[PDB]
Structures are given as C-alpha cells and as structure tokens.
Symmetry: C6
Subunit: 216 residues, 6 copies
Amino acid sequence: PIVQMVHQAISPRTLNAWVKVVEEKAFSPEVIPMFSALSEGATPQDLNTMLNTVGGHQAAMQMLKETIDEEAAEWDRLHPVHAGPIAPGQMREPRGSDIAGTTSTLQEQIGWMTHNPPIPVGEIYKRWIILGLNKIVRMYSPTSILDIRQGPKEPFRDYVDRFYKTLRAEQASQEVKNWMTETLLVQNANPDCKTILKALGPGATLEEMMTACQGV
Amino acid sequence: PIVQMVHQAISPRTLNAWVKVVEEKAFSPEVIPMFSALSEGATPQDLNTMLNTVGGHQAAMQMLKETIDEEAAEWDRLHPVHAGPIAPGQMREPRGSDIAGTTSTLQEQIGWMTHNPPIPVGEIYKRWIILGLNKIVRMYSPTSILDIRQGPKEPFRDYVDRFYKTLRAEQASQEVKNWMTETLLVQNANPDCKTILKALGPGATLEEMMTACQGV
Amino acid sequence: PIVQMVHQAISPRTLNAWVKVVEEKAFSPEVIPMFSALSEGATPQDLNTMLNTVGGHQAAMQMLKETIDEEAAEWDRLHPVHAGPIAPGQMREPRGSDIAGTTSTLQEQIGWMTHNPPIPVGEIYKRWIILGLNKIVRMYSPTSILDIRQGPKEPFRDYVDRFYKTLRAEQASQEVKNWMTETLLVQNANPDCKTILKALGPGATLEEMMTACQGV
Amino acid sequence: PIVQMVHQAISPRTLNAWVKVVEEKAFSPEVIPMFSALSEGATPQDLNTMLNTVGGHQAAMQMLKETIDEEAAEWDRLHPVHAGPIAPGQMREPRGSDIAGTTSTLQEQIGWMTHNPPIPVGEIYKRWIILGLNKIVRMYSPTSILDIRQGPKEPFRDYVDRFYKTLRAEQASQEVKNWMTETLLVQNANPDCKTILKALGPGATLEEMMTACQGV
Amino acid sequence: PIVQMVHQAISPRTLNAWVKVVEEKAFSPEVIPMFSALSEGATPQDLNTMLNTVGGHQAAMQMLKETIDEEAAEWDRLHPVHAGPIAPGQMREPRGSDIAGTTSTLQEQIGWMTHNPPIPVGEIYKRWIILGLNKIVRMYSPTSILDIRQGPKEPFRDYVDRFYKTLRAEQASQEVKNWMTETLLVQNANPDCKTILKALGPGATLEEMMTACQGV
Amino acid sequence: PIVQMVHQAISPRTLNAWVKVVEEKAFSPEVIPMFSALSEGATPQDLNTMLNTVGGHQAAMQMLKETIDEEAAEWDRLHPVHAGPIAPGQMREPRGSDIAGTTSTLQEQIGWMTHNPPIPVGEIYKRWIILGLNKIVRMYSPTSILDIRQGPKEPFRDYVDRFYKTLRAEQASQEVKNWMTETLLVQNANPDCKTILKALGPGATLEEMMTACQGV
C-alpha cells in the first residue's frame, strides 16, 4: 500500500488475514468491508495480490474478472487514450488494464496515485472489484428476502437477525431496501407479534419493535 | 487511524481483534471499552470498517444504524449547512452523514480532524456509536438489577460479582446507580450476611463489606 | 501510550495480553507487574482502557473504583483547585478525576505529561491503581503465611515455593516480611529439616538452606 | 527487501508465511501470487532465502534450478560482460548468476537496484523464478482441461469451480484460454444445462450462464 | 529498552515470550541466553519487569533476590556514595539499589545509560541477574557430570547429548570444563566405544569421536 | 541486528522462529538457509544468541564450538594482532574470539561493522557458523546418495524427491554433485524408467526426465 505518501509492500498478516476470511466465510456480506479494510491505501498490485491468492472459488473469481473487464472497457470508452509523446514532466493516461494493474508497473501505479492532480487508480479499481463482489454475494445468497418469515415459536430477535442478514445480500437500492423494511418485516412476522407491532403504528423504531415483541 | 498527526490504515490485528470480540462475547459491557480502545484515533472510515465487518447480530447492527441516524439528524438540526462556495483556504461544514463516514471521503475526514480549529468527527461519530451500543447492551441484558438476590449458600463475593455485572448493563445514571448500590445490594443479600452488614452501618466500603461476609 | 515524547494508541496485543492475563490467572501477585509492564508510558485513557476491558471479576473492579476514589479525594484535599482564567501559555490544575482519566480529555492528559515541569498523571493514577490491586490480591489470597507448614514428606524446595508465594500476597511491609522470613520459614519446617537448618545458625542464605535440606 | 529506498532483512513472518504455504498447498496455482506478494521489493538474497527454506519437494526445487539457469545463460548471451576496470563512480554488469544472487553480494544487489538507471535484478530474477514455478505447477496438475466434464447431478457452480481451477494450471496463452472458455466449458456441460446455455447464444457472461443453470 | 539511543517500553511479545519460557522449560541452561536475548538493551525497569512477571518458582526468585543484594552491597562497598549537591549539569552516583531498579526512576536510569561517560546500569544489573540465574540452574540440575555414563546399548551420539547437557549446568570454570571434556567423556563411555576412541589418541575432535563410534 | 546502518536488538519472533525450527526439523538442510535468513544483518551477539538458545542437541552444539574455534585459530594465524596503543580515531584488530562475539562488546562489534573500511564480523562469523552447520547436517544424514534406488513401483517423482534430498546433505562440491546427478540418478532408476531415460540421451533436463517417466 501507500500510507499518507511513502510506499510499502502489503503486510504478511494483511495477506494472511484476507486469505482466512475467504476460506472460512466464503462470500458473506461482511467479507466485503473486510476486503476494503484490508485494502486501505492499496495499489492495484496489492489488490491483485489479494485476489490471486484466493484458491478455490474459481467460478466466482472468473465472474469477477468479467466484471472488472466490463468496468475497464467502460473507462476506455469514456476515457479514450490520445496519441503523442508523453512529455518529460508528465505521465500517460491510464487504460482500464493499467487500472486493473495488469498492464502497468508498480512505478506507473505509484506515479498516478501521488501526482497532482491525484489519479486514484487504487481507489477506482477497488470500486470495480467491490462492484464485482456484490454481484457474487448477491448471486451466492440462497434465500430471497420475501421468503424470510417468522417461525411460530421464533423469538422476534432471531427473525430480525435473519431478515437483515438476508437483506444485506439483496440486489436493491436503499429506497427499495427502505420499502422492504417498512413493508415486509412487519408483514412476515408471526401473527402474535404481528398484531402487537401493528398497534404501535408504522413509524416506530426497531428498538421499539424488538422491545415490543420481547416477552412474546 | 491518525497518530499524534500522520495517517494510517487500521491494522489487521486491530481488525481481527475487534471481530473476535464480537463473535465470542456478543454484547457484553466490556466490549464497549474494547471498542473504544481498538478505535483510539480512528477516522469514520475506520469506525465503519469495524462495524461493517461484523457478521451476524444484524438486528443489533440495524438498531445501531437507526441510532446513528437519530444522532445525525440532531446534528443537522443544530448545525445547519449554509449555501456558498467553499473558499480556497477553507473546508465545508460537516453533515451528520459526513460524520458517519457515509457521505465524506477519507481526505475530507482527514481535513476536518487536522484543521485548526479541530473538528473531531472521528471522536463525535464514536460517541454516537457508543451511544448506540449502550442501547443494545441494555436491551440484550436478560436480567434486571432488582432480580439479583444472594443465594442461601452463595458466598458473598459471587453475589457481588453478579450484582455489579448486572449493574454495569443497566440503563441509569450514576446517581441512580449510587442509589442502587447504597440500597439494593444490602437489601438483596441473604439473611445471615444481611444482618452482619447492617451492623457495620450504611457508609462502609465494599472492601469492608466483602471482608465482613468472607467467613459466612 | 507515549514513547520518549510522541503519542500512540495502546496496541491490540498489549490489550489482548492484558485481557488474557486476567482471564487465566485471576488476581495472582504476578499480574501486578504484568500490568505495570503492559502500561509502561500509559495515559489514564490507556489505563482505563485496560481496566474497563475486564469482564467478570466485577466485585474486584468495583473495589478498585472505591480505592481510586479514595486516592482522588486525598489528592484534592492536598491539591485544592484555585479559581481563575487559565492563562494562554498555561494549563489547569488536575483534580483527582482528571487524574483517573474520567474528567479529562486525551489532549489535557497529553498536556500534563509533556509540559515542563512534568505533571505525570499517567504514573500517578497507575500508582493508585496498583494500590487498589494490592488490596484485591491481599483479600483474594485464601491462605495466611502463618498457615504454610512443611509437609512431613515435602521436599524443602516445594515448601519454600508455597512460602514465598503466600508471602508475596501478604499485607505487610518489608521489615515485617523480613521478620517472617527470619522467623517463620525455619519455625514451620518439618522436624528433620528444622533441626538441620537450626544447626547452620540464623544468618545463612536461602541458597545455603535449600542445599542444606536437599537430600532430606 | 527494500521499501521505496531504505534496505531491510526479510521479516520472520513473511518467511514463516512462505514456508507454511508450501507445506500446506504444495504447488497450487495460488501459491504463485502468494510468492510474488511475499516477495514485493525483494532482493535476490531474499528470493533465495525463500527458495532454500523449502524442504521436501526437492525434485521440483531441482527443476526450478535448471530453469533459472536456462534463463541465466540466455541473459548472458544477450548481455555479454565486457573487460575493463569498473571505474570509481560505476558498477559492473550483472551476469545471470549475479542476478540469481549466487555470485553477487548484498551490497552489489543493493547497488544495482538503487543506481540510476535502475537495474532491477530483484524483479528480473523473480520473473525467472515465477517462470520456473509455472513449469512446475503445470507439470504437477494431474488433470487436463479436456477431461473436466459436468457430472450428471453436478450443480453447474461446482463444475465451473473445477473448470477454472484446472484451467488456471494449464500451459496456454490467453488466446488459447479464451478459446477453451468459449468452446469447452459449454461443450462439456451435462446435457440438461448444455441445452439451456446453447439457447442463450454464444456471447453471454458467466454471471448469465451460472444463473441460467442455477435451478438445474 | 533503548535502541541505539531513543527509549521504548518493553514489547508485549518480548514479555509474553519470556513468561512462556519459564513456564515450559523451568530453569534449563538455554533459558539464560534467552533471557539475555529478550533483554538486549533493557533498563532495570524492564529487567524487573521480566523477573516480577514470573509466578511460581518463588524459592528460586527469592534466591535471586539474595544474590542481587549480595552483588549490590559489593557495589556499594567499592563505590561509596559521597555527600553533596548534585550540580546542575551532573547526575548522582548510583547505589546498588538504584542499579537493581528499586530506588531509581526511569528518568534516572535513562540518565545513567545515555550520559557520557556511559554508566551502563542495564548491563550491570543484567550481569548480576545472570549470575543469580547460574546459581539456580546449577542448584536445580539433578545430576552431576560424574554420573553421566554411556549405556551399554546407547548410541554414542545420545551419550554425548547427555554429557554436554549435564556439563552446561555444572559449576565450573572453562579450564575445569576442559579437563572434564578431556578426561571423563572418554572415561565414562561404554567399553566397546571406549576402546575405539582410546585408539584415536587423546587430541581427536568431537566430530572425529562421534564418527568413530557411529557404527557401534 | 543492524538495518542499512542503525542498531537493533534481535526480535522476539526472529528468536522464537529460530528455536521452533530446531525443535521441529532437527538438522535438516533447509534449516541452514533459515538460519541465514533469520540472521540477516546480525551481530555476533545476535548469532550467539541464536546458538545458545538451542537446548538439546548438545553434541552438535559442542561440535559447532570446535569448528568455530578451528576457524578462529586460522583467522589469528593469518591475522596476527600487533602491539600498540589503539590511536584515538582507530579501533583494534579483531581476534577470532572477538569475531565469535565472545571477547568483544556490542560497541566494538558495532564499531567494526560500521567503520570504513567495513570489517564485517557479523558476516564472517556467520560463515564459520554455517560451515559448522554443514559438518553437522552431513554427519547427521543417515543415508548416502549411493544408496538411493528407485523402488520397483515407486513413481519417478518420489525417487527424485529422495535423491535430491539426500544429495542436498552430501559432502561434496558442485562438480561432484554434477557428476552424481549426471551419473547416478539414471543409474539407480528402476529398470522400466531406466530404459526410457537412456533413450532420451544424456543431456535431457529434469523436466524432460520427470515427464518422460510420468505414466510409468
């Protein structure tokens, strides 16, 4: 990575941390922040490192390649490279593949990130990666949010745990999510607690809802 | 984080430490300092990191979102953003969402914390987070303090352990806590030791009380 | 902490180290140095951190609160705060609660420790803490030193191990300790080895005593 | 290694990390990035270190020697050393064996890497090493890509996992790989899912393919 | 410690390392270097730290106190403190107890070590400690070197292992050790190998001896 | 160690790493690089540290002493110390024992390594150590290379593994090794694969040989 701005190789424990994550948890929503976290300040070399050191889950990893490409081609369209001698004081325009680390050197990468104005390739690529991770997570969720219904003898607090778990992996904007929260959660609660909540009105907080259904 | 003031990505072991905590201990009062501890000097990115990397406990995590929002909206009310070009030497007023890390960049965050006067967003947000943690802890305690009573054959020292454990999670100010200490602790002791304590008067220390009931 | 003088957040492994200690060993004499060790250079924030991250042992932790208060009130008596505007170049007098970290900011704490003359709040508070730890250790020892007697078939070397173990937790000054060493140790040895030692006189070293009773 | 440019010995945990990798995973495609990752910024001493500290897998390690030599001799051919006194301000031309660390000192190595223009021996040698690793990986794969066929009751997602796993170890250029992707993957799918895919046309994404065969 | 010269608190892992050592291996000759190793650059605070954090082995630890005192009193005799105002630019003469860390502050300690000429209290005290460790090790060895005799069916290489193990813990100078090597080792070998060695003469190396008795 | 040039104590994990190695693997060829690796930049104090902290394997360790001495005496012969006052700006000539760390201080050691011209005692001694390690490894190998023969049903790849393993521990120069490679390997292969190889000629690579005997 690069700490704010002097350059560093990615640390063995960052690395090791990132590997373990994927072994243990597969593609679980939390992986994603973890990833970002482990990649704070990362160059594309470092991001590639993280990605290539995953073994197994190769269908996913392939899918992530495609996505990155899609994002790369989109970059190139918007940002077409111009012909000419890159002057002494300057540095070349980055392609998609230069962004993905594939067709750029560590110097070039370091070039783009530090230069003024900053061309934050490390952060760009990361976005594309995260993008591709969401595709995966969302695909690899077995359950839809519509399906999460409160078991007859299920404490409310567990149902909520399954709801927002399943929600965290859904393909949807916030506005949509909001709607799902405001609509479904109460709709799919078990009759006993369903009633109780209805009786609070439709603007009570979660704290209020979970404490309303606590005894039941 | 930022060490006093040069910027750093959050360390893999901080991270890993914070994850383990939540897996093992769920929402136990001690988690909270741990959190603060692990977040000394943290930016909102770092705080978000910590929070998003929790998997499971999603009802709680949702509840924590609400609270943060509540605190954010309250900020905005008191601190309304004004219209105008942010001058060359200056930086914009932070919203609630800029405080929660959501609508601000790492640069902006670094901006606010280092600038003179310091606008300590990292510490603000942390307070809001801790606030929301207390809501959770307090909710997720099964037992009320009123219920902690000394078993007939329970050594005083264990009863005390259950008392202050249960107290540490209660919703109450210090003055209230004080009262509970001064009132209940002696009230809910088993008869044998109840008497003995009464006989010391009502201003003896805990050291004195625990050593008074040691043989019994 | 602060390394000699640039400021640092307490390290995850310090933290983690301090937690494990208390889980494993409860309140064993060695904990105390460990504590000091883990707190070399610590601010009150750091010391509080250490203390609050203990879960369980809440009677003790409560007792430690009382002691700290007692020490705080004593500070205040001797060091009464004066009224007035803290001038531009100066910083306010610290209360007890400012010393315990409770009513002071990290800046203020950093202020007091670095300023000339140094007002070492980190070291003061630590003393008060250690003080309160001794109260605990001493209370939580099951055995008195008077009770440690050499088993009939007990090798001297083990008896010594139990003696100084039990001694390390006693409430006593050195002069008292000395006396206990010079008096009891030989008094409570089993007859066979009791004699042998008596025969060396009453100023022989431990090395000499343990090697005198080695065959028996 | 050397961090951008001050010199460091390779860290115990890098080391240890690299050893564990080879014990556990033998020669699995992911090892390779791991290697690169663990060697970011590495001198030939550091690279040799990594290699010599492998025990077992000595046939491979021998094969890797040969390859390195082959690459070294090729260097020498293209880059023949000239006779003469290496002037005061200069440093000698590197042989292959100077590149492999074998016939050069750490100073010389440090010389070549830092000097302007940079003669990046650390990166050269690494390429040769990685080259030799591919030879090994490719040899030590039991299965050919032609052989990966979808089991009758095999979920598509697993088949894909075996396909790209086996592909990752094949001896082939990208263009070839592309062809294999575009040709075989669909060819070797089980009849039920084979049909379904055919029906999407021959330019659909993997995401589309895996979600097309998800129910079947 | 102090790294050459900026001051540091002793690291959690140094600490932890030193504790584990004593738990696992008790007082085994190797502990000693380990100790020294773990204490490279250590102040007396750091050395005390190491020592006090040992739990159990309290007879030893007591014996080590005595020794340190003996060494301290000897210092004082040779180095008597003089009366007078320690001038502005100067620092006081160190007692034994100031050397053992007991009656000196961390500043004073830092004072003595850095000042010119260097008064290396950290290294002095360490010597006294190591001294006291040898007393212990030597006492806590069950076996004398005279007793190590080669079993009838014992491979020479194992006998040697027991010999030099037992030798490493003996109370003796080198010249004495030399003699023991040159005399006993061959004397206490089993007849078959005894002869064989005798036949090499009395100046052959260990390598030669162990390879002479390899088949037998 | 010393990082290029500011001085450091050897790290707890280096230490710990080096200990584990010797416990687990005894004297296996790979230990040696590991050693070198763990000692990059090491002073003789650090090298001694590493060596003395080995417990068990005392015959070896004794043998290593002898060797070091032999190398030390050889140094002294070639490099005889001259009589005279070591001038103000200078430093004394190093003996063998000063090289082995035994009769020199850490300052002196630091003196020799940093001074211009560099007198790299740390690297000298290391060579002598490694030398003595080879003596050991070579002795402690049970098997000779002549004895490694391919089992009738042994896959070639395993035989190769045993060959180069056993070769790595032999006492021999490269030219000799080369010969052994070019002669024996094919000679001691099982008849079926022996033939096949013979048929490739006597200049084919290992890659070619192992892939020639892969099916058989």
